[PDB]
Ligand binder design. Structure first.
Ligand SMILES: [Zn+2]
Ligand SMILES: [Zn+2]
Ligand SMILES: [Zn+2]
Lengths: 71, 808, 131, 397, 103
RNA sequence: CAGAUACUGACACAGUCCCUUU
RNA sequence: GUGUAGUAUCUG
């Protein structure tokens, strides 16, 4: 079977995947990638008059449950 | 059920393979009762044939994962026929039980097996008491090891009889043996469980406790000393008062702990045990006489023992009691001694141990000579010969020459020893080449077809050094001598001579060979007609080597005969023959021309055998790649409109190999193949679309990064319709093609195609779309951040990434 | 209904908020000066002849394997972080040729049948002409 | 149409900064890493200006940067974790005036993914192990050692995976010649994705987990995990072992807390507040960076707020138990992303937006006029800012 | 071996142990089973290198003589960032001809 | 459910037995 | 020449 590799990696869906868990992973991946690039955080810290530490803290806090509660 | 069972047991292999399918996925339908009670009594039949056992055990591997909760009631009756299965001396027989009991335990629970199998400990039979330890170990391999510790902590503490403690310690030993390094995280929790048996009042459980602690020590070879802290005293203050076979177990247990110690503990505790180690060198028994040698080797292989001290202490008694004419009777002692002797040379010095056995090859016995020669060759091959002086090298050369001269039976160690010695000496053997050459030639001449191959192998091995020794005249003389022996009837001798000729041709230049190539190839061509594997395997390489560099000495006329004869060599069996037969075509086409050679290969696509068409395909690909791609492409494409199907698929298969071989050069011929893949990806047979998918995969992978996606985007429009298939091969090729295209085009284009029917209201389409999405999602995860679509909010949720709408 | 084709792709790695085409030095040529969000200024000057593009591509391809990045990462993959590279040749890697050991410099130069001074002279000449 | 990409000015955006003896002599250099450029620079102790020695490019973003030295050595190494998906250890060569590749280990794919180590990097202060951890479920630990060849060695990585876990910060606990220990801030979210009512999203605390590295059995296990009251952002290590107590200095919102494993109380001293703030009185106060000036005689700490006010944290203890934390306002500087307390009374400040400064210390802040705060005072502290009066400006970049 | 859809790969972790290849398969890709352009070395987990399993060929399991390698396609596709490729299965096309030829 | 005829996977060919111990 | 998986078509 070729599904061994696809199972050990989180975020992998199946035929019974609901939209909510797809969108929450989509938002979580974007939140994680925001802190990676330095200029992608400079743009956020210049757009709103805040500090880099504050933006990072807010992004980390928002990861607990993005896209609202489930159904 | 019965008809299928006796059709499987007795029938032709195709019928058996066909009938095995309906019995696999129909296990729980019949129930765990009927099929098991119909298939177990047949295995209960005594004197069952060996071919029957594998067939009758393979059905379990397919029917086990259907009755997870239904294998409980008769576990004992199931395993009474499996416990003797994994004790047979056959390597494959043990696996067929070890990999089924583990799966059955994975499909069962502890409370059933433990409850049913607890009263098997108090049994007087030794066979069951020995197989129960392995029964514990195989089920403890799975189901997690820490879950069995609470149960095992009470097994080897019963006051009823020593049988329970013996069984528990044997269980621990087997677990340590067949678990590996998986017991390291909780070694301390296992040491103290069996630590109490070392002072028991019986000479029956101390030995098994020593064996178990030795197994645990060997399992964690480089780590785990602090766990073995409170066991030093019982093992250490227990050897003086112990004698006999029980002392052997203690010595074996203490041998493994020496490497684990630091530079101080090992150094200190080696001296106090070396007294018993020296005293034990003489003994009537041999089983304990090899344990002492193993302990000596293990103590030597440490960073604490110095060189001068060990040289003064162990050598004088070790080299007086073991170098006798009786150790060759047992192979185990032979192997142990030859393995142990090497580390002494590795640590204290090669010469100091070599010089004590150099004057020993001159003996009447041949077993002793064989025993000493492999030790000498192993010592020589590890360190080298930079410490050997003139007298010692002279004595060694004389001894090895005399030993090689005196040959009795078919032992394949003299060749390796002499070759290794000659290679190690290097350029210091110059005054000895004429003698060894004369001896080899004399041995080659007029013998009973058993040492001529030996001499040929020896000269093939030793041809390398003579180039550095500046002795090309004798090389040419040997090459001339070897020519007239090509008429030997025996195949082994002919193969050895061909290998020797290949070695001589390789070592020396092509333009200085004393026998002309023009006088060799006409004689070499008829040789490529024997059905023997060995002669072809080493004649094809010689022919290829000649065609590589010695191609301008040969006119193009006689190459046609070789071209026709090579087509019969693609019908061989070993892949090494075909791997060189294919490459010889590309070697010779560089000198001849890719017009007449390629025409012969095209005709070869009508042999109606699968293993030859693939080889001809690879030959066409390599001949296209070696000379030039464009000079042969129109001829290849012209052979596509013929009504035949195999030749039609041949060019498609050759295109993939050609594109894989050229790689970066495929951006120029990218346009030519497109209006062939375009009508290849039609509603034809599955083979065309299966092969064109691999063609497109290689084509896209070869041009990645050079900005040639304009035609790749057009080609992508044809692969996508051929995704909703069911045959494993076509889908396996199509997913590979899509994955190869996604790296040359980009995930942005593939995401648009994938998102079209992700939330389809069917299921078969959804499964395929989700599989494709997972394949795209695993690779280039961060690259999908900017390519995600925009989704509007529902009643109560936030589905919009507002952070990307900021404007400066 | 009528889509537009893409003729160039690249990945600078930093956010760019300035693009202008204007000559920088008296007697120069038309550049493509941009400005990054971190303080970097770069240009996207094109090639003049055709025998120089092949040499530059060969130098870049050879340095892609004879001089791996300090951290260790495929340069082609780095420049293809989001979209595949297209019709762009990195110049920082080519200018990095001036800093290696002499033996490696000779090994890199010998495939193109040129001396290290010959390679360095034109590498500096192309830079000193557009800016 | 082909294009050639040249460059005119290099990026000057500082993200990380470390200090140490990267050359070998008794002079400390600064390794400042740009967005994708590795740079080296040293200050002149006689005039105060700073020169440039190396501006090598790495061709890739850098997410972490740490420095460490081996036991009984005199050279500092550099550990870089980046988007490359590998771990790299460097070495400065003064003779060649360029870096030197030493080790390279691959432990996953490439790209700023979720489960990919490389974001948080911590090192053992004694220089015996290194921990590289991802944002989730991918904690990895290596074992550094020296052999008879006087060369650094890397062993097999040890996994410390834990599903459904978010990591805020990873720091290395200082222990004196014992097994290495690491600290992290986990927060499970499995229960938050199973309750549609949304009550599980709130009232969910984060724990301070200590990871134990077994140096005799070659495995890593977690021992202590206790819930916290309010969320924090970063941690500060305390020099322990034989010189001072061992513990952490969790800097939560509007508070600073000291916690230690075993049996030890906790100290919570509120952050001082500026006098007569004109902003809305509902915004929290957090720290942005820290520093360490560990010395054999006495050691202190530094911190900086959102407004850019340097404090001076000093711990009080008798043998092992910490009694109180004594804050004291030091100076006011523009907000920076990293500081490096240099020897010979030099301070380097790298602003996140604007020029980069470099100050010298004339007075250490002894017997001042302003009072000092402590956790012993019951119950909203205040202080009055003023000009520097303690530092002078000698160089600007 | 991609030809047999029964074999199971390990995928545990990398390490400092380099895999070896035997005479029967010298220049073959571990996954692709190709013959062109070896690129990168092969690392195996410590579970696949202990005692009797030390210095054995990755694909078949014979006495290794040369180092293993990855093809260029595996490096471009980053298929080497998965763990160790050592086979942990006996197979069905290699453990049946034994009993078929025993008779 | 079976028979027959075609086809695919550079599938492999005395493969050899390397803690099974007294 | 044999064995090890998989797939297509007609008839019963
Ligand atoms: Zn092999
Ligand atoms: Zn490959
Ligand atoms: Zn493995």
């Amino acid at each position: 079977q070729l599904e061994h590799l696809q199972s050990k990696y989180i975020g992998t869906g199946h035929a019974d995947t609901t939209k909510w868990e797809w969108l929450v992973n989509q938002h979580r991946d974007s939140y994680c990638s925001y802190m990676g690039h330095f200029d992608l955080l400079n743009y956020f810290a210049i757009a709103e008059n805040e500090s880099k530490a504050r933006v990072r803290f807010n992004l980390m806090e928002k990861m607990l449950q993005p896209c609202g509660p489930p159904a | 059920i019965m008809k299928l069972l006796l059709k499987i047991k007795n029938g032709t292999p195709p019928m058996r393979k066909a009938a095995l399918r309906q019995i696999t996925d129909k296990a729980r339908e019949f129930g765990a009762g009927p099929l098991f009670n119909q298939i177990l009594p047949l295995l209960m039949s005594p004197t069952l044939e060996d071919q029957e056992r594998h067939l009758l055990v393979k059905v379990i591997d397919r029917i086990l994962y259907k009755l997870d909760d239904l294998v409980r009631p008769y576990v004992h009756k199931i395993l009474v026929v499996i416990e003797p299965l994994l004790i047979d001396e056959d390597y494959y027989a043990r696996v067929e039980g070890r990999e089924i009991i583990s799966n059955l335990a994975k499909a069962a629970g502890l409370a059933t097996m433990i409850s049913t199998m607890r009263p098997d400990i108090d049994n007087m039979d030794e066979y069951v008491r020995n197989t129960t330890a392995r029964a514990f170990a195989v089920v403890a391999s799975a189901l997690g090891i820490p879950s069995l510790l609470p149960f095992l902590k009470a097994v080897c503490k019963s006051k009823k009889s020593w049988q329970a403690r013996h069984t528990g310690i044997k269980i621990v030993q087997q677990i340590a043996i067949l678990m590996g390094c998986a017991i390291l995280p909780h070694l301390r929790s296992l040491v103290e469980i069996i630590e109490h048996g070392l002072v028991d009042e019986q000479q029956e459980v101390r030995t098994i406790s020593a064996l178990a602690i030795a197994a645990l020590a060997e399992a964690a070879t480089p780590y785990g000393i602090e766990s073995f802290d409170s066991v030093l005293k019982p093992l250490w203050k227990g050897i003086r008062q112990h004698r006999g076979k029980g002392l052997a177990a203690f010595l074996k247990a203490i041998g493994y702990l020496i490497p684990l110690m630091d530079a101080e503990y090992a150094n200190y505790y080696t001296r106090e045990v070396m007294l018993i180690l020296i005293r034990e060198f003489q003994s009537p028994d041999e089983e304990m006489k090899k344990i002492v040698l193993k302990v000596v080797k293990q103590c030597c292989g440490t960073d604490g023992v110095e060189a001068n001290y060990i040289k003064t202490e162990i050598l004088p008694p070790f080299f007086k009691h073991f170098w006798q004419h009786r150790m060759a009777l047992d192979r185990r002692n032979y192997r142990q001694l030859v393995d142990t002797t090497v580390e002494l040379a590795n640590k204290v010095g090669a010469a100091e141990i070599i010089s004590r056995i150099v004057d020993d090859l001159k003996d009447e016995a041949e077993q002793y000579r064989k025993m000493v020669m492999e030790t000498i060759e192993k010592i020589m091959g590890n360190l080298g010969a930079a410490d050997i002086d003139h007298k010692l090298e002279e004595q060694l050369i004389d001894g090895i020459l005399y030993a090689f001269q005196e040959q009795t039976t078919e032992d394949s160690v003299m060749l390796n020893g002499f070759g290794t010695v000659v290679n190690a000496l290097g350029k210091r053997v110059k005054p000895y080449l004429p003698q060894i050459c004369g001896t080899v030639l004399w041995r080659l001449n007029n013998k009973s077809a058993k040492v001529r191959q030996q001499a040929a192998d020896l000269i093939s091995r030793t041809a390398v050094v003579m180039k550095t020794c500046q002795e090309e005249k004798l090389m040419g003389h040997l090459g001339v001598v070897l020519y007239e022996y090509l008429g030997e009837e025996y195949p082994e001798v002919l193969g050895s001579i061909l290998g020797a000729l290949k070695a001589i041709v390789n070592v020396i230049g092509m333009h200085k060979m004393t026998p002309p190539i023009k006088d060799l190839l006409p004689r070499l061509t008829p040789i490529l007609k024997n059905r023997h594997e060995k002669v072809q395997e080493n004649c094809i390489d010689l022919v290829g080597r000649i065609a590589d560099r010695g191609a301008e000495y040969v006119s193009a006329r006689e190459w046609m005969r070789i071209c026709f004869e090579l087509l019969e060599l693609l019908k061989a069996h070993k892949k090494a023959i075909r791997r060189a037969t294919v490459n010889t075509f590309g070697y010779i086409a560089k000198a001849i021309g890719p017009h007449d050679v390629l025409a012969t290969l095209l005709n070869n696509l009508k042999v109606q055998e699968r293993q030859n068409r693939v080889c001809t395909t690879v030959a066409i690909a390599i001949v296209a790649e070696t000379c030039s791609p464009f000079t042969v492409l129109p001829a290849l494409m012209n052979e596509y409109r013929v009504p035949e199907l195999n030749v039609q698929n041949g060019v498609l298969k050759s295109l993939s190999f050609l594109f894989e071989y050229i790689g970066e050069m495929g951006k120029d011929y990218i346009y030519a193949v497109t209006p062939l893949l375009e009508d290849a990806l039609m509603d034809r047979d599955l083979v065309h679309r299966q092969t064109a998918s691999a063609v497109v995969q290689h084509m896209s992978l070869g041009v990645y990064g050079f900005g040639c996606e304009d035609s790749l985007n057009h080609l992508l429009n044809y692969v996508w319709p051929n995704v909703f298939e069911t045959s494993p091969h076509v889908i396996q090729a199509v997913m590979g093609a899509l994955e190869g295209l996604r790296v040359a085009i980009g995930p942005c284009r593939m995401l648009q195609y994938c998102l079209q029917g992700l939330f389809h209201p069917a299921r078969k389409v959804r499964d395929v779309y989700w599989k494709i999405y997972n394949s795209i999602y695993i690779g280039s995860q961060d690259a999908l951040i900017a390519h995600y679509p925009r989704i509007y909010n529902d009643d109560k949720n936030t589905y919009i990434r507002y952070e990307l709408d900021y404007i400066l | 209904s009528q889509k537009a084709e893409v003729i160039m792709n690249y990945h600078v790695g930093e956010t760019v908020l300035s693009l202008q085409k204007t000559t920088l030095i008296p007697g120069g040529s038309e550049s493509l000066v941009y400005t990054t969000l971190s303080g970097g200024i770069g240009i996207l000057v094109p090639f003049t002849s055709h025998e120089d593009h092949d040499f530059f591509q060969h130098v870049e391809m050879h340095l892609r394997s004879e001089h791996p990045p300090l951290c260790g990462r495929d340069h082609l993959s780095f420049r293809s972080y989001y979209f595949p590279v297209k019709n762009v040749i990195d110049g920082d890697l080519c200018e990095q040729f001036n800093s290696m050991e002499p033996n490696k410099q000779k090994n890199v130069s010998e495939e193109l049948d040129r001396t290290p001074p010959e390679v360095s002279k034109k590498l500096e000449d192309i830079r000193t002409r557009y800016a | 149409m082909f294009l050639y990409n040249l460059t005119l000015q290099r990026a000057t955006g500082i993200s990380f900064a470390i200090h140490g003896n990267f050359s070998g002599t008794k002079q400390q250099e600064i390794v400042v890493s740009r967005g994708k450029i590795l740079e080296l620079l040293r200050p002149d102790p006689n005039t105060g200006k700073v020169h440039t020695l190396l501006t090598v490019e790495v061709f890739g973003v850098i997410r972490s940067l740490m420095a460490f030295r081996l036991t009984g050595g005199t050279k500092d190494y550099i550990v870089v974790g980046s988007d490359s998906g590998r771990i790299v250890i460097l070495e400065y060569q003064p003779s060649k005036n360029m870096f030197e590749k030493i080790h390279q280990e691959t432990f996953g794919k490439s790209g700023c993914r979720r489960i990919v180590p490389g974001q948080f990097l911590a090192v053992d202060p004694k220089g015996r192990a290194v921990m590289i951890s991802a944002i989730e479920k991918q904690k990895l630990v290596y074992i550094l050692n020296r052999d008879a060849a006087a060369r650094l060695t890397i062993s097999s990585p040890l996994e410390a995976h834990k599903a459904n876990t978010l990591v805020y910060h990873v720091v290395g606990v200082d222990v004196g010649f014992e097994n290495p220990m690491f600290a992290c801030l986990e927060m499970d979210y499995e229960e938050a994705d199973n309750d549609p009512t949304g009550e599980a999203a709130a009232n969910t605390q984060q724990t301070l987990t200590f990871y134990e590295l077994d140096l005799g059995l070659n495995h890593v296990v977690r021992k202590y995990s206790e819930p916290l009251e309010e969320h924090g952002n970063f941690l500060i290590t305390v020099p322990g072992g034989s010189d001072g107590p061992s513990g952490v200095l969790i800097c939560s919102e509007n508070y600073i807390t000291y916690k230690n494993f075993g049996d030890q109380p906790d100290i919570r001293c509120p952050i001082p507040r500026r006098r007569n703030d004109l902003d809305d009185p509902e915004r929290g106060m957090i720290f942005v960076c820290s520093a360490t000036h560990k010395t054999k005689s006495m050691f202190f700490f530094l911190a900086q707020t959102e407004q850019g006010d340097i404090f001076k944290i000093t711990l009080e203890t008798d043998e092992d138990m910490v009694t109180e934390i004594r804050l004291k306002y030091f100076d006011t500087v523009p907000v920076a992303a990293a500081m490096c307390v240099l020897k010979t009374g030099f301070l380097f400040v790298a602003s996140e937006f604007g020029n980069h400064y470099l100050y010298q210390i004339a007075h250490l802040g002894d017997d001042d006029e302003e009072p000092e705060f402590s956790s012993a005072m019951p119950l909203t502290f205040f202080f009055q800012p003023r000009p520097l009066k303690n530092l002078v400006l000698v160089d600007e970049l | 071996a991609k030809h047999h859809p029964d074999l199971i790969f390990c995928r545990k972790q990398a390490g400092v142990a380099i895999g070896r290849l035997c005479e029967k398969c010298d220049g073959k890709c571990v996954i692709c089973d190709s013959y062109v352009r070896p690129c990168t070395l092969v690392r195996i987990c410590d579970e696949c290198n202990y005692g009797s399993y030390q210095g054995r060929c990755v694909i078949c399991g014979g006495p290794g003589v040369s180092d293993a390698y990855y093809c260029k396609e595996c490096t471009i596709q980053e298929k080497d960032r998965d763990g160790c490729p050592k086979i942990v299965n006996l197979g069905s096309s290699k453990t049946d001809l034994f009993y078929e030829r025993k008779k």
